[PDB]
Structures are given as C-alpha cells and as structure tokens.
Amino acid sequence: MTVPDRSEIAGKWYVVALASNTEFFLREKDKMKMAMARISFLGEDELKVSYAVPKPNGCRKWETTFKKTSDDGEVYYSEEAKKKVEVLDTDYKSYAVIYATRVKDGRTLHMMRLYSRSPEVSPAATAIFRKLAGERNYTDEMVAMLPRQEECTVDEV
C-alpha cells in the first residue's frame, strides 16, 4: 500500500498451491503438474489470466486463457457456473490466493488456486490461505499441493 495502481494486479502469477474436494480426486492425481500464470485486463469489458502448466519429464505442458468479469476493491472474476473463481489474499504486492468453484451439468466441485508473484511466498499468503481455508470449512477437507513425486503426480506416502 502506498499509491493506487492497476498494475498492482497486472503481472506474473505463479500457481503452485491448490485445494479441492472431489470423488474423482484420485484420478486428478495424474493431471497434476507445475503451473504458471499471467494476468492482464482485456480491453473489451473482460479480464483474462493465462496459465502455462509445465511437466516435460512426465507428460508435457498446457496453456489456457480464462476471462470474463471482475469485481472492484479486491479481485473476483465470474465465468458462468462452470467457471467461478475469486482472487483474494494480496494480489497487490507479491502474494495472492484464489479459490475456484466449478458448476456444470449439475455438478459441483471445489478447487483452490494460489498465484504467487515470486517463489518466496510470504507466511501470510500460505498461512492466511490455509487459515482462511478453515474459515470456509477446513484445510485437509479441501487441500491440494503442487505435485512433486514420480512422473505427473503429487507427493504422497
């Protein structure tokens, strides 16, 4: 905090932290991969953030641009039931956390996403995200961590 600036939000976003709940969670282990992202305001009444998930030594890499509308004060973008996610924490100086909620064909699934400007994520970003996670319902109940095991799979056991 010091002076207003849209750029604060605009920049590089690093997706590493994730939290979800789904019966198909087991199947979602393979899909797990490192994730990078970049946010930018689309000059057409839409805001978009591209994310490039790399994982050559396991599968490959994927990129996708998601965009729609965004709220003031902080950052919360809607994208039809199928895609609904809100950017919270502190996407103004270096660390931000965003929770995603999917809704399609009458199906509800929860998934969180954490965008970090720099690898050195502040204790607040991680702690507040985890702490905030509980306020919503819990942490492990809805947890997920950047994959780091065999091929395309998250560390476990």
Side-chain angles (χ1 to χ4, degrees), residues 11 14 18 22 43 45-46 53 55 60 72 96 104 107 110 119-120 122 128 133 139 141 145 148:
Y14 182 44
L18 200 175
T22 54
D45 301 60
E46 287 85 59
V53 300
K55 184 57 270 180
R60 59 179 300 179
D72 300 0
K104 181 63 181 60
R107 80 197 298 178
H110 304 301
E120 179 59 4
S122 181
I128 299 178
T139 163
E141 192 67 298
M145 302 177 58
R148 64 195 300 180

Side-chain angles (χ1 to χ4, degrees), residues 63-78:
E63 303 181 0
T64 299
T65 295
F66 267 38
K67 78 296 185 300
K68 188 71 178 179
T69 62
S70 299
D71 297 58
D72 300 0
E74 302 299 299
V75 169
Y76 170 26
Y77 65 71
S78 300

Side-chain angles (χ1 to χ4, degrees), residues 19-22 99 101 110 112 128-143:
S20 57
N21 327 241
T22 54
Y99 173 34
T101 60
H110 304 301
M112 285 69 175
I128 299 178
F129 170 56
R130 177 279 191 179
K131 186 179 63 181
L132 187 166
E135 303 299 357
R136 299 302 178 180
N137 185 56
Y138 208 47
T139 163
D140 300 0
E141 192 67 298
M142 56 184 58
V143 65

Side-chain angles (χ1 to χ4, degrees), residues 12-146:
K12 181 61 178 298
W13 285 15
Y14 182 44
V15 34
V16 91
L18 200 175
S20 57
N21 327 241
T22 54
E23 182 177 60
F24 295 55
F25 179 45
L26 290 303
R27 180 61 61 66
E28 300 299 300
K29 69 175 63 289
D30 183 59
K31 300 300 179 60
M32 304 297 76
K33 302 181 183 62
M34 301 300 179
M36 303 178 59
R38 299 179 179 181
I39 181 179
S40 181
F41 297 53
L42 195 177
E44 298 186 301
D45 301 60
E46 287 85 59
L47 309 190
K48 73 84 173 299
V49 66
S50 299
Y51 52 74
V53 300
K55 184 57 270 180
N57 300 300
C59 303
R60 59 179 300 179
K61 66 294 186 180
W62 187 229
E63 303 181 0
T64 299
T65 295
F66 267 38
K67 78 296 185 300
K68 188 71 178 179
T69 62
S70 299
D71 297 58
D72 300 0
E74 302 299 299
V75 169
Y76 170 26
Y77 65 71
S78 300
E79 191 183 304
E80 302 181 301
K82 180 181 300 181
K83 187 57 176 176
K84 289 291 179 61
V85 194
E86 62 179 300
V87 191
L88 52 158
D89 187 1
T90 303
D91 53 357
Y92 288 52
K93 53 87 61 178
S94 64
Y95 57 77
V97 315
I98 168 154
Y99 173 34
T101 60
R102 173 180 180 180
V103 181
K104 181 63 181 60
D105 58 289
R107 80 197 298 178
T108 301
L109 56 168
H110 304 301
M111 301 184 57
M112 285 69 175
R113 182 178 299 182
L114 189 172
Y115 291 115
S116 60
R117 284 49 169 62
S118 301
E120 179 59 4
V121 179
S122 181
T126 61
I128 299 178
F129 170 56
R130 177 279 191 179
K131 186 179 63 181
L132 187 166
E135 303 299 357
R136 299 302 178 180
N137 185 56
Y138 208 47
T139 163
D140 300 0
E141 192 67 298
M142 56 184 58
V143 65
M145 302 177 58
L146 181 71

